[PDB]
């Protein structure tokens, strides 16, 4: 286990032949030395004799306690499950490295002495915020942007996959990325494509669910979000609809607007605190960009600012090609009449027409979609 990290010839050289035949000697000499221990000092099996000596030391009732401090000369103050805490001693088979204050431990039943530590069963909010599998199709599903698709790879993907281009330039990659535009133009859609591609752990939270009902519970949730993001890996934090922290007021929140503010001051810390940050990228998305605090959008916390426009009439035709790809489209229809139906129909409007027109076919058990399906589709989707 981690015996030798050197592989660098990568050929049929004598050096790769010599190095591993050196390691062949260090292994067998280690083997033949430790072989002579049980030959001259048998004295136990060592497979279970020292084990059953431990297993007869620690009792069959094994109470679970909780650390709260450590004094280094193998005794520490531990909390029982009731609340009455003790000052027991700590053993030597206890591998004194995984002991943090608050970690679950194993005590004795008689003298409550610290026998072992316990693996934590975590967590019912880490698994809430951690995206398990890749969501959907690739960047080829998007179509039409082609300018900001380059921009997001520039800040997130290319820093991860090619960490050579920045070093030869002697530079650090840009920190923050915000995505803004009219509603339904594909802000959330592009973040799915990043979650498709990347190898980093991907964390997602809506901006609406940052606000809480108890005092101080809001800023506590932000402090433990970036705790989780740092303690895994290179990671991506995606915050969606962050204008919703300020626009809507809810009566569940006990503090008024001056509790929203204290939540935003904690988030304003976590992006550009004085603590050593690490490898955590932040992606943010909104549609009301003029509402939120400009202290949060300054360079240093967010570097790249990406605007999404409404789809153009030659890029609209690309979108109809995408969402009507795998459907049995009857040749009655002409897509160009559907393009300029609304002068400013979003990309979300196109998928809303294409799905609803398919639902009109299943009312009549058909398999192909005719023209009058789309004729009564836009009456149903758009005009109400």
């Amino acid at each position: 286990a981690s015996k030798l990290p050197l592989v660098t010839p990568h050929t049929q050289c004598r050096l790769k032949l010599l190095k591993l035949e050196r390691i062949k000697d260090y292994l067998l000499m280690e083997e033949e030395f430790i072989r002579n221990q049980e030959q001259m000092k048998p004295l136990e099996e060592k497979q279970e004799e020292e084990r059953s000596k431990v297993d007869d030391l620690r009792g069959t009732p094994m109470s679970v306690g909780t650390l709260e401090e450590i004094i280094d000369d193998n005794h520490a103050i531990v909390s029982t499950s009731v609340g009455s805490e003790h000052y027991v001693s700590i053993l030597s088979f206890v591998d004194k490295d995984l002991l943090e204050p608050g970690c679950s431990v194993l005590l004795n039943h008689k003298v409550h002495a610290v026998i072992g530590v316990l693996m934590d069963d975590t967590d019912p909010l880490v698994t809430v915020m951690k995206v398990e599998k890749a969501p959907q199709e690739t960047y080829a599903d998007i179509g039409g942007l082609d300018n900001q698709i380059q921009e997001i790879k520039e800040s997130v993907e290319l820093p991860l996959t090619h960490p050579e281009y920045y070093e030869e330039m002697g530079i650090k990659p840009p920190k923050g990325v915000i995505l803004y535009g009219p509603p339904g133009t594909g802000k959330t859609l592009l973040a799915k494509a990043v979650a498709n591609q990347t190898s980093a752990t991907f964390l997602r939270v809506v901006g609406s669910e940052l606000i809480q009902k108890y005092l101080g519970d809001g800023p506590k949730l932000v402090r433990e979000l970036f705790r989780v993001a740092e303690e895994h890996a290179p990671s991506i934090v995606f915050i969606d609809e962050i204008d919703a922290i300020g626009t809507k007021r809810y009566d569940s929140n006990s503090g008024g607007e001056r509790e929203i503010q204290r939540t935003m001051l904690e988030l304003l810390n976590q992006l550009d605190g004085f603590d050593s940050r690490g490898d955590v990228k932040v992606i943010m998305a909104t549609n009301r960009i003029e509402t939120l605090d400009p202290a949060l959008i300054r360079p240093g916390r967010i570097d790249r600012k990406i605007e999404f426009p409404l789809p153009d009439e030659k890029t609209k035709k690309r979108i109809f090609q995408i969402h009507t790809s795998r459907m049995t489209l009857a040749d009655d229809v002409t897509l160009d009449d559907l393009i300029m139906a609304k002068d400013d129909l979003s990309g979300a409007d196109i998928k809303a027409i294409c799905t609803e027109a398919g639902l009109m076919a299943l009312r009549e058990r058909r398999m192909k979609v005719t023209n009058e399906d789309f004729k009564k589709s836009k009456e149903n989707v758009l005009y109400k």
């Binding site: 049929q12 020292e50 030391l57 053993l91 591998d95 330039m169 050593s276 300054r298």
Partner: protein, 394 residues
């Protein structure tokens, strides 16, 4: 030529490593056990020496003593209160009142005094570790550094120039300006160079859920700080911890003001903090309370303005000293193009223009690569700009 011959002779000796290390004992991937060849000290001896003679010694808390006799009154978590006695192994000196002690389960007598409770959310905000920001990175604001550095470290590094002259030097200092000016950055340079305990506090960590809970964390901060000889408290974004007392009608924002009053009491009056030096840093100081802006608490009032011209030229030389550039570019032309720009924007200009070199092919930036980054960062992101409603601090 010997393609398999190096390979299978590699593979079996990589296996023969594992095939005998399983015969030594590192295996049985545990649920909380040790390396098996490491616990042999307590294998036979201290298994029956740290366990069978040694006892549990349940820990308690002392109410008071009384005259003429030991007769100590003790207290535990939920159970009753007893009248106890010492052991022989400890003197009656360090069994002072209000002190946690360990106590046996049968006779209920005192074994050893204990360190007090630290309330572990205050334990995490000790920094323990230093950042890498040097004062060489805080260029452009030299006079602001010097007026700061004579308050924080020169009474600590030389406590004789002030004593023999006969002056008690100032104790507190706040740092205020527009955002992205270098306030939090300059505080990192202080923690780099110093030697005392550097206890940082972010003001959005004192808002608690119960009533009066936040005011106790202010005490436990200054309790452990008075134990230390010299200590340096850092307060960041204190417009959360208290603006002003303005109570009208329904009492709103009443709870945060009690935390702000407890902080004022720990800074002045009645056998003071002694050798504790505080350091606040706000973003808009017009909201702050007049009793907190009083000297004796916040003596120095360092301003972080925007750099003039030579402040800006020095910042370009910091954030672009370590990047592959054309030799013949001039920075003085660039600083004339950014009239009211923070130090945070000048870094983002330099990091953006390197990306233009990575856009096409090349390996070093040019002068026009900077100019393509200036109009994008300064004049195209100018809709946001973050500054002009913060110069007036509203």
């Amino acid at each position: 030529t010997y393609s398999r011959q190096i390979k299978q002779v590699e593979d079996d000796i990589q296996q023969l490593l594992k095939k005998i290390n399983e015969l030594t004992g590192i295996k049985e991937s545990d649920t909380g056990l040790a390396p098996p060849a490491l616990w042999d000290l307590a294998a036979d001896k201290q298994t029956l020496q740290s366990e069978q003679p040694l006892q549990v010694a349940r820990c308690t808390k002392i109410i008071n003593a009384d005259s003429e006799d030991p007769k100590y009154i003790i207290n535990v978590k939920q159970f009753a209160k007893f009248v106890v006695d010492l052991s022989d192994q400890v003197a009656p000196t360090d069994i002072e009142e209000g002190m946690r002690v360990g106590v046996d389960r049968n006779k209920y007598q005192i074994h050893i005094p204990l360190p007090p409770k630290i309330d572990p959310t205050v334990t995490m905000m000790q920094v323990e570790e230093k950042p890498d920001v040097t004062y060489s990175d805080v260029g452009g604001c030299k006079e602001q550094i010097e007026k700061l550095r004579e308050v924080v470290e020169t009474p600590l590094l030389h406590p004789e120039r002030f004593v023999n002259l006969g002056i008690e030097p100032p104790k507190g200092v706040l740092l205020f300006g527009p955002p992205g000016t270098g306030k939090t950055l300059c505080a990192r340079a202080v923690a780099n160079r110093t030697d005392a305990c550097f206890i940082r506090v972010i003001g959005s960590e004192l808002v608690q859920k119960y009533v009066g809970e936040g005011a106790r964390m202010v005490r436990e901060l200054f309790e452990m700080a008075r134990t230390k000889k010299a200590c340096l408290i850092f307060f960041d974004e204190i417009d959360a911890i208290g603006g002003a007392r303005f109570d009208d009608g329904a009492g709103g924002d009443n709870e945060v003001q009690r935390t702000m009053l407890e902080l004022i009491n720990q800074l002045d009056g009645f056998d003071p903090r002694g050798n504790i030096k505080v350091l606040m840093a706000t973003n808009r100081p017009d909201t702050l309370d007049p009793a907190l802006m009083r000297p004796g608490r916040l003596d120095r009032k360092i301003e972080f303005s925007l750099p003039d011209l030579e402040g800006r030229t020095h910042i370009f030389k910091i954030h672009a000293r370590s990047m592959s550039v054309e030799r013949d570019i001039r920075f003085e032309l660039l600083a004339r193009l950014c009239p009211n720009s923070t130090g945070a924007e000048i870094r983002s200009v330099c990091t953006e223009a390197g990306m233009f070199a990575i856009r096409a092919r090349r390996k070093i930036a040019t002068e026009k690569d900077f100019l393509e980054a200036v109009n994008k960062v300064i004049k195209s992101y100018a809709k946001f700009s973050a500054t002009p409603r913060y110069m007036t601090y509203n």
